């Protein structure tokens, strides 16, 4: 999930936005 | 080591600020 | 004030730890 | 709810209930 | 400034980025 | 109450997330 | 109104820093 | 060292929530 | 100790309670 | 109480050290 | 990254060691 | 500074130089 790919390496805050409702 | 747990606490705070509290 | 906003940042953290 | 855990202190149990 | 603007009311991510130096 | 201090504290964090150094 | 409870949360992090 | 300090930082916030009025260190 | 037990693997809410006062 | 003390006015890290 | 994460703790440490600016 | 204090930990004294 988010943890496996955003803990791996630092996600951009664009990548992160895609997880918002 | 509990690395994924630690990072996860940071991710909720980043999700909080990105998705904006009605999110 | 950002009272509610700050409070919520703590909540998400509490909810993470409990969930 | 923010409304209820920011006007007063929520317990672990109240927090567990905000999960599912 | 930053404290006033952002401790008065919520500053979004795009708004806080205007403070990057 | 130490309200400025506490909000300042969340700000520096949110600035780090958006600005890095 | 959970002011004491929020402050105390930063407090313990400040203490953790100081007491190494 | 760093990773130990970082972890401990999260422990105390966690203890703060779980320990309520009780506390966890004076 | 809490470090050896809770940093090497994830502690439950009950494991954490053991270190309260 | 550390709490009452440092949630009224900001405590220095040295005030904080005493409670270590 | 444990490092990017660490930086987050670094600013909180600098905020309270330094004061406010 | 992130590099320096995250490879090896910095004491409060060192941090005070970055004030
Ligand atoms: Cl961390
Ligand atoms: Cl706060
Ligand atoms: Zn806070
Ligand atoms: Zn952390």
Curated annotation (Swiss-Prot), chain C:
Outcome, altering residue 10 to D: In HPRI; Providence
Protein name as it appears in the record: Insulin B chain
Positions spanned in the full protein: 25 to 43 of 110
UniProtKB/Swiss-Prot annotation, chain K:
Origin: domain of life: Eukaryota
Protein name: Insulin B chain
Parent-record interval covered: 26 to 46 of 110
């Amino acid at each position: 999930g988010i943890v496996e790919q955003c803990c791996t390496s630092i996600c951009s805050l664009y990548q992160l936005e895609n997880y918002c409702n | 080591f509990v690395n994924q747990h630690l990072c996860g606490s940071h991710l909720v705070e980043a999700l909080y600020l990105v998705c904006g509290e009605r999110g």
